[PDB]
Structure 1
Amino acid sequence: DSTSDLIPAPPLSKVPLQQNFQDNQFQGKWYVVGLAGNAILREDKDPQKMYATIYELKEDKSYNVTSVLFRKKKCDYWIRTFVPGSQPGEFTLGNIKSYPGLTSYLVRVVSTNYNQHAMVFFKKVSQNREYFKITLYGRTKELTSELKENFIRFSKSLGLPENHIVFPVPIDQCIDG
């Protein structure tokens, strides 16, 4: 039992897909350098820490995707599968039935140059609520003011105000394996 209120998800027409997506080149470790979404809230008290996400391309061309987070003084690992969707660079979550409440989960790689930066769009419906986010990935923990501003401009184009955009603080624990 609850009430909640969310900024509506954008139409998918407003979310570009990276042209000629190269699944092999996208593999390896990415740091989460920016986050924006209808459940992202800039929280001064307890700032969001950076985490890392590792993409491994399997034989069947799905990804095994592993996120590594520092929480409660430990390294925490979240492993899931991205299954190729309706065009290259688009995916759905594998084994959706195994996640209670979850009815849909879409990933779309918006842009990347494979060896420095990427922006990836996610949309999920859980308990009948529609969440969306944009993740800014870096191959390193830093990215430029310019790239941050581009991410902010893109996020705003999807209806997000500035207080729904955060830049996680770089850390050294866990994520530099």
Structure 2
Amino acid sequence: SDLIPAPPLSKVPLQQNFQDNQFQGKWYVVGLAGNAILREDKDPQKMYATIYELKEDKSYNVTSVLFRKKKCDYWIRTFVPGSQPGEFTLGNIKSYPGLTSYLVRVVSTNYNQHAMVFFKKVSQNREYFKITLYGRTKELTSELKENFIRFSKSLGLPENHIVFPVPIDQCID
């Protein structure tokens, strides 16, 4: 493949004074953009949800729930606190085959309605990045969507790498 290069981290803001306890709970993925994310009219991406649970030791247990082949699929991972509040690395990285690097940065959030989170990983020596627009509900405003599109474009993503998953009711309620 050919991939749009990951942006330097200097183009990716960090939420100031990030509050780990307030970021906990369920978030819906209302927007998704990345260098391996592709818009698809034939079968448009369904919304999924991600649950953040703050463990005793201040890492997150992170569970994603997706409706796929008539069933609920669960993906679990551990985000370990990084150099600053709002940054994380992936726990137990040796148990993910091909994975040499995984970085999470919370870009912005108001905790009770929305968040943007930046992800970067190196897998099979290929550098992938994505931005998730999270909502506490399945809908967000035009203003928040446009902010997410503007930000995604500042990182070099064109429109067809920016998707808005369609709301569903299976699995994620």
Q: Is the structural similarity TM-score above 0.5?
A: yes
| 1:148 equivalenced with 2:145 (yes/no) | yes
Q: Which runs of 5+ in 1 are unaligned?
A: none
Could you give the per-residue CA deviations for residues 106-129 of structure 1, whole angstroms, max 9, x where no partner exists?
000000000000000000000000
Please name the residue that 2:83 is paired with: 86
Please give the secondary structure, in 2, of the residue aligned with 1:32.
Answer: strand
Q: Taking structure 2 as the reference length, what is the TM-score of the superposition?
A: 1.00
Q: Which runs of 5+ in 2 are unaligned?
A: none
Could you give the per-residue CA deviations for residues 121-163 of structure 1, whole angstroms, max 9, x where no partner exists?
0000000000000000000000011110000000000000001
CA distance in 1, matches of 2:110, 2:144: 13
Could you give the per-residue CA deviations for residues 26-64 of structure 1, whole angstroms, max 9, x where no partner exists?
000000000000001101101000000000000000000
CA distance in 2, matches of 1:15, 1:97: 26
CA RMSD of aligned residues (A): 0.3
CA distance in 1, matches of 2:125, 2:38: 21
Select the residue among 57, 61, 65 that pairs with 1:64.
61
Divergent runs of 4+, >4 A: none
The count of aligned residue pairs is 173
CA distance in 2, matches of 1:146, 1:120: 17
Please give the secondary structure, in 2, of the residue aligned with 1:82.
Answer: strand
CA distance in 2, matches of 1:66, 1:141: 17
CA distance in 1, matches of 2:150, 2:75: 29
What fraction of aligned residue pairs are identical, expressed as a percent? 100
Q: Taking structure 1 as the reference length, what is the TM-score of the superposition?
A: 0.97
